[PDB]
Amino acid sequence: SEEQLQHRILTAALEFVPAHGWTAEAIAEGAQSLGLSSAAASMFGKDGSELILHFVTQCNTRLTRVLEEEQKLVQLGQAEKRKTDQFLRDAVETRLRMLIPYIEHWPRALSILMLPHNIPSSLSLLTSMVDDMWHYAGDQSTDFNWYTRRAMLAAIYNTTELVMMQDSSPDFEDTWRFLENRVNDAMNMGHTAKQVKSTGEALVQGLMGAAVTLKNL
Amino acid sequence: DYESEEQLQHRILTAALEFVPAHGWTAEAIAEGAQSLGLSSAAASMFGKDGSELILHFVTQCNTRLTRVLEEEQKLVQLGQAEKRKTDQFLRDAVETRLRMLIPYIEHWPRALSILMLPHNIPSSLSLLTSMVDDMWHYAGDQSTDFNWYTRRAMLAAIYNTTELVMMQDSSPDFEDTWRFLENRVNDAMN
Secondary structure, eight states: OHHHHHHHHHHHHHTTHHHHOSSHHHHHHHHHHTTOOGGGGGGSOSSSHHHHHHHHHHHHHHHHHHHHHHHHHHHTTSSOOOOHHHHHHHHHHHHHHTTGGGGGGHHHHHHHHTSGGGHHHHHHHHHHHHHHHHHHHOOOSSOOOHHHHHHHHHHHHHHHHHHHHTOOSGGGHHHHHHHHHHHHHHHHTTOOHHHHHHHHHHHHHHHHHHHHHHHTO | OOOOHHHHHHHHHHHHGGGHHHHOSSHHHHHHHHHHTTOOGGGGGGSOSSSHHHHHHHHHHHHHHHHHHHHHHHHHHHTTSSOOOOHHHHHHHHHHHHHHTTGGGGGGHHHHHHHHTSTTTHHHHHHHHHHHHHHHHHHHTOOOOSSOHHHHHHHHHHHHHHHHHHHHTOOSGGGHHHHHHHHHHHHHHHO
């Protein structure tokens, strides 16, 4: 189909983004690398929208397969289930490291992803990614609701992504330290006023249970 | 007539705004507001160390002021004293009206935005943003379509947040560049 051809061209174009950006230039090079004329890039706008969203989709697919591989390793008993805070730090780092070959041009990619006509796609990819991370985190520990989970992790990811753009530290250590702090901020939002009440009341029932036992002899 | 503990905090935070230009969106400004009301240094113990409460307080006042502006513009149209604007024009005017509320506080607003992006503030900041955006659409009076509730909210939130970021870097006369960016984004969305 004509969609399979577009996906092939856009995949080939990714090799050329480092030198040419998210541009028709890169798409033309991708088309030429498949034996096609540069005019094949006529199938896409000039924004770079299609190529960037293609890359984001590929990255989220790669992430899910890594997380599924990590989970199966736990199912084999060859790895221990990580705590939520550790799991989320590892999942975000794994996902953001996929940007490194393209990092010179990622600030522009982000600005294109933020164009109003791209926001439905960009936000849907982001939301599915976040939902996927939480699925494999399991958590069932914190008592955030679906909304708090999404908002906090989207913020963790989006702010860490921005910090990465300005990070000149070796292997982006400053980015992962920012990430560690933001995940710690979110994990401490689990200590709501409700949880003080529910845990305080759980202890009341615990104390009353001891009173009945003590009474009984 | 007496005051509740929420009215007291509201008073402290309103007074704290005077000290933002000199102290930023910080606990120091909050403490300064408390002393300007005659309260002890112990007053600021009721607030965190972020300055978050002050920032969220200001965002709320701005969104409240905005709803009142929109209510007034709508009443003029109901009275036949003004003609209903097209959606694209309405949203450009509403976003400009809202972002112009930042100008007296723009020196420190770049840091305030970053604090609002922290996980412990996002649920609140994101709720204020969505309610504001939903409020803008309510008064636009756009009766379909080409975008639904979800696409409408998402696009206008992006228009607002990206225009806001551009505004932080804009030293052009009367923020001409920001409104030119805004017009460009609204045209991108409607098309």
